[PDB]
Design a protein around this ligand. Structure first.
Ligand code: SF4
Ligand code: SF4
Ligand code: SF4
Ligand code: SF4
Ligand code: FES
Ligand SMILES: [K+]
Ligand SMILES: [Zn+2]
Lengths: 106, 114, 207, 688, 125, 51, 48, 95, 82
């Protein structure tokens, strides 16, 4: 809620990803925080299996409800950290409500 | 050093099988150039066939020779029955691959590969 | 009475042990080892010379009747001088039982084709030849079945790289699909996952 | 003979008396769980994770501290044993913080791994946890002390291995805290090893923080080149980048430790790098060019000079392959002026006899010595892992150590004989009381530092020290095969260069100034343009832009030790080879290949094209250079002593003062460490 | 019936491996060193075969690590040094073998911590 | 040690966090062995020979 | 959302955006990390 | 905050920006560079420090099982605040 | 002219006994005579003993010394030095 990233660069999502679709680099931020400098998802490697959001200990990476994001070029499906943070800012209102409905089954 | 043979008891039987396969490939090249409508000539096809046989000229194990002949025959059956396509037949010629240097200095300039 | 632990079935274990030695008594010329797993599967380890006698006996014998070849495959273990293990999984409908028969071979030693015993073996043996390079003698029609035409190598060998040696693309200059040495925009990332602490003392090997 | 019989799970094993229960289990291939125990530290017995049942004995014993008894049957998988482990693991995890996602130890944590293998799968702790404050102990080690499990490994390592009694425990009970009590830095030259021994993420590497996880790193087994010890390391890389350096166990060299320079200077490989060939433009400024142009200019100049007009200087991080390739190249123009920056006296036998310039006792031989004489050396900073071996003997063998030189802190009490080089003549004549100790000693060891030979009377120093060892061996009372005389080196490339026949020191260049000069990684500044003709042509081949590069006419970028498979000979004479962890950056190339390519352009092609072929060449020059991990013995010390006495020399009146007197001079001693931003932090911290 | 074949096993022409990746490669046969960050020794039991490291470069689009080396990830496990060498001989690879490094046996004594007159006496527990 | 803990427990208990961490990185170890397991799949017998 | 409005956050987009593929404001990938190796810079003055 | 490089390219929260002469910025010509404008480092620093009356406090990020793993923070040092290693919230001891 | 002499021998093999005898006996006098000539004696186990001579411009000749006597070794070096 404060606007801080949930992701702590633990790399559990990267380890479990069946498709090796996640690439992560991290270092200490300008303050002492443990944060990513690279967070990529190759959406053309991803199998949309959801293991990454299961593996995440802080609910940082989620699969949202959007399924209407087909593109005209391949490169537009290679998401870097800026694109994914924008997705979270774009979809948080729906995402938080969906997690609210399902987190007691998890 | 006692082992189970594949087809040939010794290297003289094996070389007989090798010569027979070479004849079958030699006879086939004119048909392959015709059926697949290749822009190479029959000499080029037969030169390539000869090249493939000479890369293995140093084998002395009849079981290894038996397998190369076995694989060579499957390779030929794919061609005669047109299970292969033009792309598969032309993969032997590496047309789109640029020439990699073999001398030291040329390798030195491009990168680190020995 | 232990909700999470798989129950044992010692009756089936007893029955399979008795049959395992029954097969060893009838086929001593070939059988090299018989074992029964803790989850009750019987494996017969035979000399490769006995593939036809052993499979024929299991199919035709009145106390066997393994009329169905469920699966036939190979395993590659590079540390063995006979690196390939050939595995036959058979099912007997009459006695509602399964049996596994295993043998071995290397890159240059042929294994007798079992198509005369099980016609199901025809494609299974082509797959083994295709993916492992094991040659099956007297096969009615041995050729690649899964790999691309003209493909070179046997991908299921442990020393064959995951991504192979060649990749394909369409080239406009020659107006056809071409094969070229493989380059990956992102190399597959090898993970070292094995923990350095032993997990199963029951399987420890002598030092 | 005296072996007693015990049983592990009913299997008989014969062990020496005094063997612990934990050691008896290892002989049948079982590893008992542990936290506080470490085979190179004193036994503690506090974590209780090694508790194991002895058959028909009511109480479980601490397997790490309990000597076995004849006939004992050690039930290492009993219900009693397994339930002891579950209880102990449960207490360890009660106050432990839920940190694994943010903890650097994650994935290579003994607490995680032994919880998985020997612990329960859930928690019944329903209270709040302890939280401890963090403690600053310098820029190299981060402390998140709430993760500490009070195993005291760091305390025992700091005291026993580093010889520093700064770490301890304060308070008691559940509030007992590991630390220094006061605000204090733990900045030993071996301090980084407490990161490795700490079983949890309580002590982690500050430079490495958060950058990688264990499972995703590729491990290249290599050799350190920050000193002449030859420490075995593992370079951890990920996606073509070097992430950290770890020790690699070698009992006869570094055991399982490394120095801080070895561990933390790798970040100097990421900065100030030579990545492209460079030549001087039309205004005398270096500009990027291609390899073809750069090599042509050098080859053109090479073809116009001969004899004394061509010389070379090999720096401290050069590999044997580059050394032999450059020697052959200059030989083909009849030049013999192949020099090193590091001086060795060429008087007498010089480099003719390997025994004259080697650590003949070997590193592991220190553990058999009974008296050690150190001359003109601060082994603490010149060879940190060699000084740790001395302290190990000083501690476990009651070794007697004496020193001639500055009274530096060696981390163990020694007998300071004085810093005057004249003291050596008194020992030899028998006047000095310490002369009697050497006669008494049954395995004496005299060690002369290579730094003491950088003086202008190094030949006198070597002859004096060599003389003392000569009397000891002639005096009898010493087993024949024991070696007394030793030279302790500090430069990774020195021994290989002396083996190949390089002249030690740049004296020859000063004697006969050349017209064309090769600087093979030479960054000591021994030769500058003021010692050379005005229009001298200087080629610098190296991996860092430091001292040599900014004065060169041509720059040929080479590979660092992490970027090539190259041979280095340590101070014992043992040859070792690195492996490629990552490839050289940019346009840089393997160093012997640059010389081989330059030879073809110059029309003087060398007769080897591959790494195996150049290594066959090394065998021709010195066959020991391809016997990896083998220490070939060198004899004929009597011959060296005879020659050394022929020419009288006078010692100077300068007292022996090593180049390194305190820790601040340890961190930067070469191009890589000088470009390391971590080493700069260490220097700032220890001087502020 | 069996035949006598009096040659060293050599299968490089029936493995499909390209010429470049048989004779330019250098296999290393070794037992992996213990990860010094942990005390467990279970990853030091088997012999490994790995090949020489080659170039990895940055993908222009995303910055990923690209490779043109098909053997970069190929690692083989063997029971003994002899098995690994035999596998490399018959495949035509040049190899370097490294002796297994077993930890030395140590003399451990808890009572040494309290010595009457030795230096092993500890100043803290 | 086989099935990951519930998320609420992973965020409260030290044992659960450790086991979650290890299951989603290393995964559980399987005792050595081999099985041919088959079911009556809709298309017939579907089996795995898992080593 | 009229009856059950969503939770308001400062960082949530106030203005929703449709699919921008094929337009000047489409997403273009790039590496988000900085250069890893620093190259030596030669001195700017002559001295040789 | 989102600076702009002298060329005009926006600098990201990771400090990334193509330098002058880097051809790779051609990929943004006629298009745009995707940059998230909500820098987490700035937002977290706007949260007020929380005063607590105990030596140790616990943080789960808020929201119960929707937050992060619960950690306990020590507040003994008075020269600084106690920070949560997961969410970056700061705590101080009330006298 | 001659530039360098390298002698390789085994520390223990009986095939190197003559060379070991030469080094122990008459190396000091050979070096005393040729002060500026490098005579690199390099011992390595299980190597065939051998004499290497390097002349101007990188030309090298090697002479085997296997099972040579201390006298034969002396003859071999005299040929090289002359
Ligand atoms: S959903 Fe996609 S990114 Fe996530 S684990 Fe599955 S394949 Fe990987
Ligand atoms: S998204 Fe979650 S699982 Fe992935 S690195 Fe970040 S915190 Fe770890
Ligand atoms: S020390 Fe180990 S158990 Fe403790 S938080 Fe770190 S990884 Fe987890
Ligand atoms: S800091 Fe680490 S090594 Fe030191 S006592 Fe705590 S857990 Fe043990
Ligand atoms: S390992 Fe024995 S009590 Fe700690
Ligand atoms: K640690
Ligand atoms: Zn928090």
């Amino acid at each position: 809620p404060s606007g801080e990233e949930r992701c702590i660069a633990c790399k559990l999502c990267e380890a479990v990803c069946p498709a090796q679709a996640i690439t992560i680099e991290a270092e200490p931020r300008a303050d002492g925080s443990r944060r990513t400098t690279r967070y990529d998802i190759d959406m053309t490697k991803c199998i949309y299996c959801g293991f990454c959001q299961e593996a995440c200990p802080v609910d940082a990476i989620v699969e949202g409800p959007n399924f209407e994001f087909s593109t005209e070029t391949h490169e537009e499906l290679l998401y870097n950290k800026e694109k994914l943070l924008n997705n979270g800012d774009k979809w948080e209102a729906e995402i938080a409500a969906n997690i609210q409905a399902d987190y007691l089954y998890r | 050093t006692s082992v189970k043979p594949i087809f040939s008891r010794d290297m003289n039987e094996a070389k007989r099988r090798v010569r027979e396969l070479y004849r079958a490939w030699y006879r086939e090249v004119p048909n392959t150039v015709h059926l697949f409508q290749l822009d190479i000539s029959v000499k080029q096809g037969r030169d390539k066939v000869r090249e493939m046989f000479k890369k293995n000229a140093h084998i002395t194990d009849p079981r290894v020779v038996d397998l190369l002949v076995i694989k060579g025959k499957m390779e030929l059956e794919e061609t005669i029955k047109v299970w292969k396509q033009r792309t598969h037949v032309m993969r032997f010629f590496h047309e789109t691959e640029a020439p990699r240097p073999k001398d030291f200095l040329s390798k030195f300039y491009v990168g680190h590969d020995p | 009475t232990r909700p999470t632990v798989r129950p044992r079935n010692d009756v089936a274990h007893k029955q399979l042990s008795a049959f395992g030695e029954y097969v060893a008594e009838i086929l001593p010329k070939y059988v090299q080892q018989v074992q029964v797993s803790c989850f009750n599967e019987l494996e017969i380890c035979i000399h490769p010379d006995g593939v036809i006698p052993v499979l024929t006996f299991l199919r035709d014998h009145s106390n066997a009747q393994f009329k169905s070849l469920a699966d036939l495959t190979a395993v590659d273990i590079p540390t063995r001088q006979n690196r390939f293990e050939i595995v036959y999984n058979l099912l007997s409908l009459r006695f509602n039982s399964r049996i596994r028969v295993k043998t071995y071979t290397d890159e240059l030693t042929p294994i007798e084709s079992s198509v005369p015993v099980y016609k199901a073996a025809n494609w299974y043996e082509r797959e083994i030849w295709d993916m492992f390079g094991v040659f099956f003698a007297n096969h009615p029609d041995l050729r690649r079945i899964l790999t691309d035409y003209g493909f070179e190598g046997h991908p299921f060998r442990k020393d064959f790289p995951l991504s192979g040696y060649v990749e394909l693309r369409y080239d406009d200059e020659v107006k056809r699909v071409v094969a070229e040495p493989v380059e990956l925009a992102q190399e597959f990332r090898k993970f070292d996952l094995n923990s350095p602490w032993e997990a199963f003392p029951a399987y420890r090997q002598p030092p | 003979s005296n072996l007693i019989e015990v049983f592990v799970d009913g299997q008989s094993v014969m062990v020496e008396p005094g063997t612990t229960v934990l050691q008896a289990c290892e002989k049948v291939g079982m590893q008992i769980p542990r936290f506080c125990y470490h085979e190179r530290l004193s036994v503690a017995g506090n974590c209780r994770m090694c508790l194991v049942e002895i058959e028909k004995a009511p109480k479980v014993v601490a397997a790490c501290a309990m000597p076995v008894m004849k006939g004992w049957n050690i039930l290492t998988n009993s219900e009693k044993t397994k339930k002891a482990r579950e209880g102990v693991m449960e207490f360890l995890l009660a106050n432990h913080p839920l940190d694994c996602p943010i903890c650097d130890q994650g994935g290579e944590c003994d607490l995680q791994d032994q919880s998985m293998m020997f612990g329960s799968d859930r928690s019944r702790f329903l209270e709040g946890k302890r939280a401890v404050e963090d403690k600053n102990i310098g820029p190299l080690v981060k402390t998140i002390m709430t993760r500490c499990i009070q195993c005291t490994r760091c305390i025992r390592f700091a005291s026993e291995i580093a010889g520093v009694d700064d770490l301890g425990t304060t308070g008691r009970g559940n509030d007992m805290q590991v630390g220094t009590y006061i605000e204090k830095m733990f900045m030993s030259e071996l301090s980084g090893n407490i990161i490795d021994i700490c079983p949890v993420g309580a002590l982690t590497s500050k430079p490495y923080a958060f950058t990688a996880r264990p499972w995703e790193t590729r491990k290249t087994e290599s050799i350190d080149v920050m000193d002449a010890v030859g420490s075995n390391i593992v370079v951890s890389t990920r996606t073509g980048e070097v992430m950290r350096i770890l020790p690699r166990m070698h009992e006869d060299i570094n055991e399982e430790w490394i120095s801080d320079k070895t561990r933390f200077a790798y970040d100097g490989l990421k900065r100030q790098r030579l990545t492209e060939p460079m030549v001087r433009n039309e205004k005398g400024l270096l500009t990027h060019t291609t390899w073809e142009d750069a090599l042509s200019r050098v080859a053109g100049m090479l073809q116009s000079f001969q004899g004394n007009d061509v010389a070379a200087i090999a720096g401290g991080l050069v590999d044997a392959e580059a050394l032999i390739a450059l020697k052959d190249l200059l030989n083909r123009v009849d030049s013999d002026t192949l020099c090193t920056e590091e001086v060795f006296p060429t008087a007498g036998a010089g480099t003719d006899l390997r025994s004259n310039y080697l650590l003949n006792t070997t590193i592991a031989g220190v553990e058999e010595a009974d008296v050690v004489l150190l001359v003109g050396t601060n082994p603490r900073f010149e060879a940190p892992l060699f000084n740790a071996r001395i302290r190990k003997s000083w501690l476990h063998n009651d070794l007697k150590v004496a020193l001639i030189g500055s009274p530096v802190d060696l981390t163990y009490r020694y007998d300071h004989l004085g810093d005057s080089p004249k003291i050596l003549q008194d020992i030899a004549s028998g006047s000095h009381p310490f002369s009697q100790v050497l006669q008494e000693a049954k395995k004496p060891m005299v060690i002369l530092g290579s730094s003491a030979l950088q003086r202008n009377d190094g030949a006198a120093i070597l002859a004096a020290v060599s003389n003392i060892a000569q009397k000891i061996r002639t005096s009898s009372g010493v087993t024949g095969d024991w070696k007394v005389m030793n030279i302790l080196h500090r430069i990774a490339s020195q021994v290989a260069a002396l083996d190949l026949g390089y002249k030690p020191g740049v004296e020859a260049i000063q004697k006969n100034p050349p017209k064309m000069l090769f600087l093979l990684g030479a960054d000591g500044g021994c030769i500058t343009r003021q010692d050379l003709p005005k229009d001298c042509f200087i080629v610098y081949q190296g991996h860092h832009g430091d001292v040599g590069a900014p004065i060169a006419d041509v720059i040929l970028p080479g590979a660092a030790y992490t970027e090539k498979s190259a041979t280095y000979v340590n101070t014992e004479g043992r040859a070792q080879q690195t492996k490629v962890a990552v490839t050289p950056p940019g346009l840089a190339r393997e160093d012997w290949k640059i010389i081989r390519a330059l030879s073809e352009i110059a029309g003087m092609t060398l007769p080897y094209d591959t790494l195996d072929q150049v290594r066959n060449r090394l065998e021709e020059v010195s066959p020991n250079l391809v016997r990896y991990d083998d220490v070939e013995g060198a004899n004929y010390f009597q011959q060296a002593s005879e020659l050394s006495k022929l020419v009288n020399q006078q010692l100077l009146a300068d007292p022996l003062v090593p180049p390194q007197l305190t820790i601040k001079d340890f961190y930067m001693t070469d191009s890589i460490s000088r470009a390391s931003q971590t080493m700069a932090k260490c220097v700032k911290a220890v001087t502020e | 019936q069996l035949i006598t074949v009096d040659e060293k096993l050599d299968i490089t022409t029936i493995t499909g491996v390209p010429e470049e990746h048989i004779k330019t490669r250098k296999a290393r046969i070794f037992v992996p060193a213990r990860n010094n960050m942990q005390s467990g020794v279970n990853n030091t039991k088997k012999w490994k075969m790995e090949f020489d490291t080659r170039e990895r470069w940055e993908n222009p689009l995303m910055g990923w690590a690209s490779t043109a080396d098909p053997l970069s990830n190929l690692v083989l496990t063997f029971s003994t040094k002899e098995d690994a060498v035999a596998f490399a001989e018959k495949n035509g690879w040049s190899y370097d073998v490294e002796e297994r490094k077993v930890p030395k046996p140590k003399s451990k004594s808890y009572g040494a911590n309290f010595s009457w007159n030795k230096r092993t006496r500890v100043s803290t527990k | 040690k086989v099935s990951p803990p519930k998320r609420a427990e992973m965020k409260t208990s030290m044992e659960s966090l450790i086991h979650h961490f290890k299951l989603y990185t290393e995964g559980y170890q399987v005792p050595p062995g081999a099985t041919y397991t088959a079911i009556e799949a809709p298309k017939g017998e579907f089996g795995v020979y898992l080593v | 959302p009229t009856v059950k409005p969503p939770t308001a956050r400062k960082f949530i987009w106030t203005n929703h955006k449709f699919n921008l593929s094929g337009t000047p404001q489409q997403y273009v990938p790039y590496s988000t990390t900085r250069k890893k190796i620093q190259e030596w810079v030669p001195p700017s003055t002559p001295y040789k | 905050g989102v600076r702009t490089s002298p060329t005009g390219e926006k600098v990201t929260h990771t400090g990334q920006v193509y330098d002058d002469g880097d051809y790779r910025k051609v990929r943004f010509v006629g298009r745009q560079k995707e940059v998230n404008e909500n820098f987490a480092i700035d937002l977290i620093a706007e949260q007020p420090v929380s005063q607590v009356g105990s030596r140790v406090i616990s943080c789960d990020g808020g929201g119960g099982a929707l937050g992060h793993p619960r950690v306990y923070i020590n507040l003994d040092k008075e020269t600084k605040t106690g920070t949560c290693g997961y969410c970056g919230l700061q705590f101080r001891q009330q006298h | 002219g001659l530039r360098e002499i390298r002698i390789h021998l085994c520390q223990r093999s009986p095939g190197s006994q003559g060379v070991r005898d030469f080094i122990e006996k008459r190396y000091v006098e050979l070096k005393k005579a040729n002060p500026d000539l490098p005579i690199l004696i390099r011992e390595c186990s299980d190597v065939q003993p051998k004499l290497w001579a390097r002349y101007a411009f990188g030309q090298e000749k090697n002479v085997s010394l296997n099972n040579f006597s201390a006298d034969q070794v002396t003859r071999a070096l005299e040929n090289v030095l002359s």
